[PDB]
RNA sequence: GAUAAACGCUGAAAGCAUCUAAGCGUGAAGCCCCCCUCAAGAUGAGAUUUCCCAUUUCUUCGGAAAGUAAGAUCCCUGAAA
RNA sequence: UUGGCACCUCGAUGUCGGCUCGUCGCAUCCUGGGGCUGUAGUCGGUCCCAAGGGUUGGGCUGUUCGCCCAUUAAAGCGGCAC
């Protein structure tokens, strides 16, 4: 069970040896460094803490500079933990290159979905519009709040609200190409996020 | 309960350990029921006389007997496979029966219990723990149990199957 | 007039360790609720908290008479529709015995702000060991 | 299995037993299997 | 993983029988895990790593006031929000 | 459900069907597990366990309902101010 952090660069497409044309997300994962190994004795669970892209000194604070020092590395923009991995693999201050993944490998991409802002129930919850004609004054509205008897609205009556910007995990994305000199993975299909989004690629739990 | 020769019994609380030539058994009994070890003879003692105890009192002599008899001479449950193409092969330790299914069904013999097949159309479960011999033979029979129309399936040795058209 | 009223901190709150091994869940609980409410002290004042701290050890060995192990159901409602979860007392004694005794005893304490303070004085342990040795707890018999 | 309030021997091979505090008749003839 | 209905094994009460009383096993789209997300206001406020340090003034001890540290903000340029 | 009663509301508890949104019960329509079968097999029937999810597009009728066309694993029955 391997893992790595990268930024979504954007999508494109590649021709397979077969000749088929597949869509791909390009994930640039330069500058992954192991920062900390968490053990059952010290923290209470096994995990490896990986720092991703280098951050200018003035953008870091002393708490940050003092935590990366232990790994003899510059401060990092993103730090995430990976559970369910072999702590024997991974040394403090080691690089984590995209070569940990091969072609045909099956991964789970985790990231935050694009922000839609305040949205209504048609876009946010896929509800039905009311009629648009035949005298209707009921188009993009959320429907009855519920029955009379409770004298209240049940929880999970779906209503308008802020829509995206949620952690999402797409499971079972095939890695298509691994390019070490450019520190790039091509994952088949799309992963959550806007371009430049942090994407967490771990070996598929399934 | 008369202990045969070579057999030994020990009592370290409310549990009894019956070790003999063929194997070695342990069984936790009800504390209330008191057991007496002599040289060659065991006697199980009932304290009161309620519907709770009278029951336990019997169960103990019988299980204790079934622990002693089981380590001395042992227990055999013999099964028959009736039907066309219904055969049993033992290819290592795993018992393997072809019994009409599109896949073969295989059984790894539990610790202490030993499957073996003289003919292809009969299986014999052997062991010391009459309980464990019982639960393997049952499970083997439960693969394809005796159907009432032709009599096809895996039955016990002297078992009466009901018949129909 | 003249009836004594305990002041906060006045009465000496002592630490007691109670072995739950083989005592009925209630029977254990009713005695402890009394010790927590401080009903065993002549200084008992209904509005104060003159009661003792209680550590229960071996709560995994608490007793359930009859079929209560399988038939006593503990219910929780999330407040979402159809959000009713249930656990059997037996399952809960095996896995979260701390929680079994806490539920049991929380029902026999007053249902007010003071009752919520009393419950903070209760320390339940599945096994035989606690980390409250520093409070020098005294063994208590039921 | 016949599940019914009134569980009675249907033939003379029928036997009335109790299991798990339910009354039942068992019989060679499987049509006679009853549980209360 | 534990169960329902169900099928059993071993087994006495009741020298037999008996799935049951003690005791084992098998067994559902269900139950609890597993999968996804939120989640320590979990006031029961949890854990790990790293940073800052023990200043000054008066004050009855209690504490109060003031400049600071690490750090954060106001303000400004913005968008992937 | 058809009713009985007249207990709340006549200084207003203001409406049948449809639409939108569901949620609950289980007396289960489908899917899962099982017993019996007039269970050879296939296709079925019936009862037990089971409420996790699922459970449709039209024509005619204001019509709930119904009838019909064509599907579907199935086109469940009820409650929530019908
Ligand atoms: Mg946006
Ligand atoms: Mg529509
Ligand atoms: Mg309009
Ligand atoms: Mg209310
Ligand atoms: Mg028997
Ligand atoms: Mg099982
Ligand atoms: Mg009148
Ligand atoms: Mg009014
Ligand atoms: Mg039912
Ligand atoms: Mg119409
Ligand atoms: Mg209405
Ligand atoms: Zn009969």
Q: What does this 3D model show about the protein?
A:
This is part of a larger assembly, with chains A (206 residues), B (165 residues), C (142 residues) and D (36 residues). Chain A has 206 residues and is mainly beta. Chain A has helices spanning 62-68, 121-125, and strands at residues 3-15, 21-28, 33-38, 47-51, 79-83, 106-112, 118-119, 161-162, 167-179, 184-188, 198-203. Chain A is globular and about 70 Å long. Chain B folds into two domains: 8-73, Ribosomal protein L6 (Outer Surface Protein A, domain 3, Alpha-Beta Complex); 75-155, Outer Surface Protein A, domain 3, CATH 3.90.930.12. Helices cover 19% and strands 32% of the residues of chain B. Chain B has helices spanning 53-72, 130-141; strands at 8-11, 15-19, 24-28, 34-37, 42-45, 75-82, 87-90, 95-98, 105-107, 114-116, 123-127, 153-156. A four-stranded antiparallel β-sheet of chain B has the order 10-11-6-12, with helices on one face. In chain B, strands 1-2-3 form a three-stranded antiparallel β-sheet, covered by helices on one side. Chain B has a three-stranded antiparallel β-sheet with strand order 7-8-9, with no helix packed on it. In chain B, a hairpin with a 4-residue loop joins β4 (34-37) and β5. The longest helix of chain B is centred in the middle third of the chain and has 20 residues, at 53-72. With 142 residues, chain C is α/β, with parallel strands linked by helices. In chain C, α1 links the parallel β1 (15-19) and β2. In chain C, α1 crosses α4 (97-106). Chain C is globular. By secondary structure, chain D is mainly β. Helices cover 0% and strands 39% of the residues of chain D. In chain D, strands 1-4-3-2 form a four-stranded mixed β-sheet, with no helix packed on it. The radius of gyration of chain D is 9 Å and the shape is globular. The chains are: A mainly beta (206), B alpha+beta (165), C alpha/beta (142), D mainly beta (36). Chains in contact: A-C. The interface between A and C is small, with 3 and 3 residues. The structure holds magnesium ion (11 copies) and zinc ion (ZN). Chain A binds two RNA strands through residues 35-36, 38, 42-45, 49, 61-70, 114-115, 117, 121, 127-131, 136, 138, 141-150, 154, 157-158, 164-169, 171, 193-197, 205-206.
């Amino acid at each position: 069970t391997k893992g790595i952090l990268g930024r979504k660069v954007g999508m494109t497409q590649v021709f397979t040896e077969n000749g088929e044309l597949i869509p791909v997300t390009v994930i640039e994962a330069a500058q992954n460094v192991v920062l900390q190994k968490k053990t059952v004795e010290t923290d209470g669970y096994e995990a490896v803490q990986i720092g991703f892209e280098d951050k200018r000194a003035i953008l870091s604070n002393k708490p940050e500079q003092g935590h990366v020092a232990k790994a003899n590395t510059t401060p990092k923009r993103f730090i995430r933990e990976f559970r369910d991995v072999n702590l024997d693999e991974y040394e403090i201050g080691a690089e984590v290159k995209v070569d940990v993944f091969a072609e045909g490998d099956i991964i789970d991409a985790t990231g935050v979905s694009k922000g839609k802002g305040f949205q209504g129930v048609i876009k946010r919850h896929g509800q039905s519009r009311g009629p648009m004609a035949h005298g209707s004054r009921y188009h993009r509205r959320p429907g009855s709040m519920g029955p009379v008897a409770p004298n209240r609205v049940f929880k999970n009556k779906l209503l308008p609200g802020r829509m995206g910007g949620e952690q999402i995990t797409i499971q079972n994305l095939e890695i298509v190409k691994v390019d070490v000199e450019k520190n790039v993975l091509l994952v088949k299909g799309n992963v959550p996020g806007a371009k430049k989004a942090l994407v967490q690629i771990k070996t598929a739990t399934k | 309960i008369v202990i045969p020769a070579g057999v030994t019994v020990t009592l370290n609380g409310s549990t009894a350990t019956v070790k003999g030539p063929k194997g070695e058994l342990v069984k936790e009994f009800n504390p209330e029921i008191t057991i007496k070890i002599e040289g060659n003879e065991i006697n199980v003692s009932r304290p009161t006389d309620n519907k709770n105890h009278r029951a336990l009192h019997g169960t103990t002599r019988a299980i204790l007997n079934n622990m002693v008899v089981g380590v001395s001479e042992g227990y055999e449950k013999k099964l028959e496979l009736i039907g066309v193409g219904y055969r049993a092969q033992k290819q290592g330790d795993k018992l393997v029966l072809n019994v009409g299914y599109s896949h073969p069904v295989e059984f790894v013999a539990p610790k202490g219990v030993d499957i073996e097949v003289p003919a292809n159309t009969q299986v014999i479960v052997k062991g010391y723990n009459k309980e464990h011999v019982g639960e393997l033979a049952a499970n083997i029979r439960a693969v394809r149990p005796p159907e009432p129309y032709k009599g096809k399936g895996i039955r016990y040795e002297g078992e009466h199957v009901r018949r129909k058209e | 007039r003249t009836t004594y009223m305990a002041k906060p901190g006045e009465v000496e709150r002592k630490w007691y360790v109670i072995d739950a091994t083989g005592v009925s869940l209630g029977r254990l609980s009713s005695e402890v609720a009394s010790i927590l409410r401080g009903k065993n002290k002549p200084q008992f004042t209904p509005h104060i908290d003159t009661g003792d701290f209680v550590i229960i050890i071996n709560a995994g060995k608490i007793g359930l008479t009859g079929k209560k192990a399988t038939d006593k159901i503990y219910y929780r409602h999330s407040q979402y529709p159809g959000g009713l979860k249930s656990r059997t007392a037996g399952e809960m004694r095996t896995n979260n015995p701390e929680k079994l005794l806490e539920l049991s005893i929380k029902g026999m304490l007053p249902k007010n702000s003071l009752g919520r303070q009393l419950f903070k004085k209760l320390h339940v342990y599945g096994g035989s060991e606690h980390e409250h040795a520093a409070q020098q707890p005294e063994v208590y018999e039921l | 299995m016949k599940v019914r309030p009134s569980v009675k021997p249907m033939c003379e091979k029928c036997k009335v037993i109790r299991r798990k505090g339910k009354v039942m008749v068992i019989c060679e003839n499987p049509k006679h299997k009853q549980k209360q």
